[PDB]
Amino acid sequence: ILGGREAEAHARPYMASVQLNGAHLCGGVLVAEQWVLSAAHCLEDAADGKVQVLLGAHSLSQPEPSKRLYDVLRAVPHPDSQPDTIDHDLLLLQLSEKATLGPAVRPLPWQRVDRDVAPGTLCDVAGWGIVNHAGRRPDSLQHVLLPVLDRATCNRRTHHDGAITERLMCAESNRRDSCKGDSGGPLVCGGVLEGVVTSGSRVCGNRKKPGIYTRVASYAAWIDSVLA
């Protein structure tokens, strides 16, 4: 996260760290007792090792009573996702067992009504991704409030010329943005999961190139089918 600040410890109990061989790889969101939602392209590389999910954490390195590392039973990428595109960039991870719930570990309700968030609304994004252009990685969870961009504006020639479909949403990126290592994490508006940070190499903090998030409401049918 660029231009943000350290998050209140354990104030976002749904936050997950998707790890590859003990190292943080991508963010994730707990959406059910045994299911974590992340981005598909995170698995593209996760394939080289053992994938685990860390729940109830604030610090990636210090012991915390709420911290729990869970193994993964199965990984279910969206069937239409492709390596060369940012469409359908969702992934569902089934934990080896139901997560022990508590004040520091709790699933987050997700958006089912397929309606765009009003332009200007401030949504919260959190992650353990890089905090500056040098590539510095934080030990503790960071977060930043970002205002949502109207659908039309993101598609400008000087921005994401038509790259934004109805299943994608954008948020302002002026000096504050989600960045490398934050992909797969949550974009929460009004206490509900609205988006997931899309994977894909892109500049962070550049106002001409807004951040892109995958709208979960567009995939309500796919999520429902996988969790069934």
Curated annotation (Swiss-Prot):
Disulfide bonds join C26-C42, C123-C189, C154-C170, C179-C204. One of its GO terms (biological process) is complement activation, alternative pathway. PROSITE patterns: TRYPSIN_DOM, TRYPSIN_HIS, TRYPSIN_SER. CFD is activated by the removal of 5 residues at the N-terminus, named activation peptide, by the MASP-3 isoform of MASP1. The active site is at H41 (charge relay system), D89 (charge relay system), S183 (charge relay system). SUPFAM superfamilies: Trypsin-like serine proteases (SSF50494). It comes from the Eukaryota. It is found in: Secreted. CDD domains: Tryp_SPc (cd00190). Keywords: Complement alternate pathway, Disease variant, Disulfide bond, Hydrolase, Immunity, Innate immunity, Protease, Secreted, Serine protease, Signal, Zymogen. Changing R202A: Increased serine endopeptidase activity in absence of CFB, while decreased ability to cleave CFB. GO terms for molecular function: serine-type endopeptidase activity; serine-type peptidase activity. InterPro entries: Peptidase_S1_PA, Peptidase_S1_PA_chymotrypsin, Peptidase_S1A, Trypsin_dom, TRYPSIN_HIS, TRYPSIN_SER. Residues 1-228 form the Peptidase S1 domain. Residues 198-202 are annotated as: Self-inhibitor loop. Circulates in plasma in a mature but self-inhibited form. Activated by factor B (CFB), which displaces the self-inhibition loop. Associates with CFB complexed with complement C3b. Specifically inhibited by anti-factor D Fab fragment (AFD) antibody. It is linked to Complement factor D deficiency: An immunologic disorder characterized by increased susceptibility to bacterial infections, particularly Neisseria infections, due to a defect in the alternative complement pathway. Serine protease that initiates the alternative pathway of the complement system, a cascade of proteins that leads to phagocytosis and breakdown of pathogens and signaling that strengthens the adaptive immune system. In contrast to other complement pathways (classical, lectin and GZMK) that are directly activated by pathogens or antigen-antibody complexes, the alternative complement pathway is initiated by the spontaneous hydrolysis of complement C3. Belongs to the peptidase S1 family. This is Complement factor D. It comes from Homo sapiens (Human).
